[PDB]
Amino acid sequence: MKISVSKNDLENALRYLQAFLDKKDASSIASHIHLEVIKEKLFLKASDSDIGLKSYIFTQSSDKEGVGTINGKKFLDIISCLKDSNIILETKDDSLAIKQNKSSFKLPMFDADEFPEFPVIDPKVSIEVNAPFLVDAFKKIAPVIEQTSHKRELAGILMQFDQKHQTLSVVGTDTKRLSYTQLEKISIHSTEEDISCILPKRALLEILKLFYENFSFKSDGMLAVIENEMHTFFTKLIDGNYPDYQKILPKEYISSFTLGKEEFKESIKLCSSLSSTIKLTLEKNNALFESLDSEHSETAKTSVEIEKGLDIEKAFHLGVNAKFFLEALNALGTTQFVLRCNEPSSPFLIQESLDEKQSHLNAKISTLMMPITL
Amino acid sequence: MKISVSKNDLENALRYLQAFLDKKDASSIASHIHLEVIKEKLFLKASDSDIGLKSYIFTQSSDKEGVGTINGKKFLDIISCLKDSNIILETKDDSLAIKQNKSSFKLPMFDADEFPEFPVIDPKVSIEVNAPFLVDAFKKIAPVIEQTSHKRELAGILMQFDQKHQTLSVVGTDTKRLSYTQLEKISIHSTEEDISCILPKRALLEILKLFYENFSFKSDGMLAVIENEMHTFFTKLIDGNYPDYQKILPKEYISSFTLGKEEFKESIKLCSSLSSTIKLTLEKNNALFESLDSEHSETAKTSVEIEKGLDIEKAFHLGVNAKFFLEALNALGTTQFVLRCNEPSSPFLIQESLDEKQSHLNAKISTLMMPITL
């Protein structure tokens, strides 16, 4: 091959690709990016059986078309050390030459025939995402999912597509808490009325780096493929049978309290200076927070006034996990939140104020958590 | 005790003290700060046989004088979670109560009688530092000193005081490189005409966090004590007999080249994308840099034009350690540097352009390095 490219364009493409390389063993083609010049475009890809990214940039000049490979980490280290002028890339034999003015480099290429084939699917379901609601949901739900979850299907996020009712439900859970959202009025094309894709957490995190809005999401039940103008990303899906969250959501809630989000964040952070768990006491015009989990003779307490009185006769006590409660509040875009409760020994809900109100750009995440006893 | 203090004042004092606590075992008094209220001042200290800091802040109100202790990490975690209003601190029995409005905390105190005594010295040497030259020297020399240097006295920085000639020499070395500076016109008070203090690296690093200028430095040959208005710091010294750097500095240099600092930094960083060592070739109007240490079939090269010709007939080749060379340049405040050379197999010097010129505020650091062969 022989081309010249913009330094910035190349650098940016290389940064995105770093996360799809096994960088530790440079002698393996898994540490390499595959390169292919084609009619005024350079395509860069890094792939394996589980995950991959294909990107392109435009060439500033193109002289000779072809394919090749190069160590992705070294390539990026080199480029990030160069000036902002254009970079000439040119193969020699099984070596890639890189030149910019007085600076020149060589790196070994591998046999491109060993490079994994970049899959293509024939999609069973597909959507066009024209707003940030989906990545908004991914971002807000991701904290509840542990990547090394020793149970296979909880290690990922669930995308449940309802062709019939044009809804996409997004769910994450570890076993102590569960966060979900139901996205309405989503134009779903699908061969079946119901289908569920489980994205590995690792894939979820890469998706957040690559995509925001104006992308397509397609899947054949085995791989999910996401594309916009510059990128094609894919991931293997996790086998199947995500627990149905709908069955373990409580039917009713005796108590629903509208409370101050930032005051609760501040008060919970404060008590977690000495504990992981907190005792919350709600009264008509007052919220009290006490460290619960703290070591002997270490105590942390605070309270906040509640101006618009709660519908409480005397006092409601609820033991909570401080981090989970904070992360539940972190996931909300409202200044106030609703806490829904029943018995203090039973799971409780945290959601946005006016969660029922419909929006378009953003997702509204609800979180169900198990309480701590006493 | 019973006092109130400014939240910011307290927080800042606590941050400085964190580094003088063994934080991992909270059950040990080594994790605690000692507190003592005295006539409108609160003193906070953390100390051991080797190192310590004593600080104070003014009290906003004082009601009851006394002493006590508290876990430094927990104390800071609590305070950093509070609002900016004043904080009431008040003992109860062997517990410290902390209150700010609706927020209140308790932490256990230990028997203050176990707390290490904060040393005082009768100083054999003393200086007043009214400019940043000393910490400037510390900062520039610190990178060449390895803290876990398995040789005892190279693990610290040397302060050599010449009462006679009113000079303080500061030196650091690992065995491959040595950096030094001679500070002139320093008002030294001392019982002897010559004395040397070796500061442990750990102490050096804390000093950089605490002090800049307008402080005193005193020592009794065993401890060094540094004080300004707010702080008294001390460290144990390292036993003695720092190798005399003066004997291994070359007498003369055949070649002295004035070169571009930033161009050399850029060119060296560039080649170190693929190597730790670089082959430098100086010609009359050109500097060439080639990766030396790089793996087979990985090459990095660049050059820069030298407008004001060097006094070279054909070409001078010098193998260098890239990091050491960069750190040598990092230590210089000039846009140009001088490289002094002799034989390519013999140690060479890097110093500021016009190193001989005298300054007041800043230190001028020179670095002697051993070359790499071929």
Residue numbers in the entry:
A (entry chain A), B (entry chain A): 2 to 375
From the study:
The sliding clamp is a ring-shaped protein complex that encircles DNA with the help of clamp loader in an ATP-dependent manner, and slides along the DNA. Although β-clamp is part of the DNA polymerase III holoenzyme, it is not attached to polymerase III permanently like the other subunits. β-clamp is loaded on the DNA, by clamp loader, a subunit of DNA Pol III. In both prokaryotes and eukaryotes, a key feature of this clamp-binding motif is the presence of hydrophobic amino acid residues that bind to the hydrophobic pocket in the C-terminal region of the clamp.
In the space group C2, one monomer was observed in each asymmetric unit, which interacts with another monomer from asymmetric unit to form a dimer. However there is no significant difference observed between these two structures from different space groups, the structural alignment of both yielded an RMSD of 0.15 Å. While Hpβ-clamp was found to exist as both a monomer and dimer in the crystal, the dimer was the dominant component in solution according to a gel filtration experiment. The β-sheets along with loops were found to form the outer surface of the ring. In domain II, the loop containing residues 210–214 was observed to be shorter in Hpβ-clamp than in E. coli and the other homologs. Moreover, in E. coli and the other homologs, the B-factor for this region was found to be quite high, compared to that for the other regions in the protein, in contrast to the case in H. pylori.
